[PDB]
Amino acid sequence: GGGRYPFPKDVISMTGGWWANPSNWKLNGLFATGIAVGLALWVSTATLPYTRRREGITSESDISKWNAAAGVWRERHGKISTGEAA
């Protein structure tokens, strides 16, 4: 290629090295694309049940009941809201 220099051929990195472009890269790229598409499909399909929207999951009646129970607890324990001590 252009702008190239000698390099030690016995240096082995998990990345390429110096201008890595082996003469089988279409087959290996086919393998890598297959593994990548499969991994992406697996992760998406398996993470579908762990997704949710922010809103519309809990009825506001549940929210009303929980806030009312909170008030019940707060006056059972004899507590006043923030700022009322003045």
Partner: protein, 49 residues
């Protein structure tokens, strides 16, 4: 740094007056919608009206 912050401080005395009052909000300053309980108005209540 001293030039910057000293000039910044000096320039505050040469500031024009505002032309409109701040905004004001209907229900006694939205103390309920901001989390008040009729004794917490001074803490959570916004401007008068």
């Amino acid at each position: 740094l001293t030039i910057f912050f000293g000039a910044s401080y000096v320039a505050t005395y040469f500031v024009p007056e505002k032309a409109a009052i701040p905004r004001e909000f209907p229900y006694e300053g939205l103390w309920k919608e901001s989390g008040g309980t009729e004794k917490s108005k001074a803490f959570f209540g916004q401007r008068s009206e």
